[PDB]
Amino acid sequence: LSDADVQKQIKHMMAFIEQEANEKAEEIDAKAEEEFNIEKGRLVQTQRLKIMEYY
Amino acid sequence: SLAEIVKKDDFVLDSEYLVTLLVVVPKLNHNDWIKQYETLAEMVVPRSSNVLSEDQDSYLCNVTLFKKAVDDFRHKARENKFIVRDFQYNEEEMRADKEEMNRLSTDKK
Amino acid sequence: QSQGIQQLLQAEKRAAEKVADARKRKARRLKQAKEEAQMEVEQYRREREQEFQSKQ
């Protein structure tokens, strides 16, 4: 072993940690696609219905 | 109660991804502890894994690891013939305990 | 080690800062999308109002 190899192990830890945090960011993106679309649909529906009743 | 014996300066802060552990004991097992506290688990961090206390019969030593690698250290401590000595970050608890022991000491008087 | 540990915490916290930016942008882009859907809805429904007016 060497300090460089032990730091390779430490950077494997950092790789897992960064993967976790970046998976949280990726989850934010998944929200911004799918739940973004879901609440878009909800609000579009309510607007269109409150206008269609009046029409 | 390990309390003030624990070296508060050697622990990780904001431990959301890195966690430290304390399962080290007897003196007769420390012939290569200088390499052990660098290599006990797959990814042990070598220097903040510092010796907290030094008796004639035992050494008390912290170690650092990843969120999910702590169990490996827990088992490897048994493989190295140690016993659990965990501290679980009881600094404010130690301060309150200090106040209470002093309260009892003064209550006697 | 100490410098390395500061670097590790700083990597975690750089990811946290990027996540905070993503939070701000998620909120703002949700608002922008709501407002854009509102632009579409108002355009089409007010066009329907004018069409109804002329049709009547």
XYZ file of C-alpha atoms in Angstrom, chain A:
55
model
C 0.000 0.000 0.000
C 0.838 3.696 -0.163
C -0.686 6.998 0.876
C -1.837 7.345 -2.736
C -3.659 3.995 -2.629
C -5.248 4.731 0.747
C -6.393 7.997 -0.820
C -7.772 5.977 -3.736
C -9.914 4.190 -1.149
C -10.862 7.537 0.425
C -11.795 8.845 -3.021
C -13.937 5.740 -3.545
C -15.794 6.912 -0.450
C -16.057 10.363 -2.013
C -17.315 8.774 -5.228
C -20.125 7.055 -3.331
C -20.889 10.243 -1.377
C -20.951 12.393 -4.512
C -23.107 9.752 -6.184
C -25.584 10.060 -3.311
C -25.688 13.868 -3.472
C -25.851 13.854 -7.272
C -28.655 11.292 -7.035
C -30.502 13.799 -4.866
C -29.919 16.356 -7.629
C -31.035 13.780 -10.209
C -34.151 13.260 -8.101
C -34.715 17.010 -8.282
C -34.525 16.680 -12.073
C -36.935 13.731 -11.976
C -39.349 15.902 -10.005
C -38.884 18.803 -12.440
C -39.951 16.408 -15.204
C -42.697 14.227 -13.754
C -44.116 16.041 -10.715
C -43.590 19.237 -12.671
C -45.882 17.730 -15.317
C -48.320 16.470 -12.673
C -48.916 19.851 -11.067
C -48.945 21.423 -14.530
C -51.808 19.076 -15.344
C -53.626 19.858 -12.109
C -53.436 23.622 -12.590
C -54.246 23.511 -16.312
C -57.260 21.346 -15.496
C -58.599 23.663 -12.805
C -58.117 26.773 -14.960
C -59.730 25.202 -18.018
C -62.663 23.903 -15.977
C -63.320 27.213 -14.222
C -63.386 28.775 -17.693
C -65.465 26.025 -19.332
C -68.178 26.261 -16.690
C -68.478 29.992 -17.419
C -68.550 29.405 -21.183
